[PDB]
Design a protein around this ligand. Structure first.
Ligand SMILES: CCCCC1C(=O)N(c2ccccc2)N(c2ccccc2)C1=O
Ligand SMILES: CCCCC1C(=O)N(c2ccccc2)N(c2ccccc2)C1=O
Lengths: 81, 81
């Protein structure tokens, strides 16, 4: 099911999340232990549907991480399945 | 109506929010310009119903700010009316 998660960057600007583009989607490839990403329950294999309001269908892995990096207000919003 | 807001501390650990205890409730007394608080649309007079899962009914102004300070994971959750 659809779910929104809100991640706050840690004190070094990081969230602890690696993403993979595949099958026209964006998926969670690696979640760092004890991180903003693990705090909201992200897991290997989760699909990311939106990042900061934008549909990620057809984004590259590097685009998805760029948009993560460009987060506004120390805050990353994502829609997940 | 009920609403949840999620605030991410800025890079100096701050959120830009002053709260007042009155009439058995917690209300927004001051919102700093260009802050985590203004980013989520908080306004003078808003009522804070919950902070980080806890009902704030009957909290002191100093308790409410303490709980703000004790935020977990660089993240403040609030329920607002
Ligand atoms: C607890 C360790 C945190 C490192 C983690 C992170 O915060 N970013 C990360 C860094 C800046 C913005 C968004 C995420 N990336 C990352 C992974 C792959 C490619 C690029 C960045 C990471 O692996
Ligand atoms: C853009 C300026 C930010 C200052 C603002 C803030 O982040 N906290 C604040 C500081 C630490 C934790 C939570 C909030 N308080 C504050 C107000 C009244 C009493 C105590 C703290 C503030 O006024």
């Amino acid at each position: 099911m659809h779910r929104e998660v809100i991640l706050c960057k840690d004190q070094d600007g990081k969230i602890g999340l690696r993403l993979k583009s595949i099958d026209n989607g964006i998926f969670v490839q690696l979640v760092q232990a004890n991180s903003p990403a693990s705090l909201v329950g992200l897991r290997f294999g989760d699909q990311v549907l939106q990042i900061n309001g934008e549909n990620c269908a057809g984004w590259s892995s590097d685009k998805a991480h760029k948009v993560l990096k460009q987060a506004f207000g120390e805050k990353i919003t994502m829609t997940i399945r």
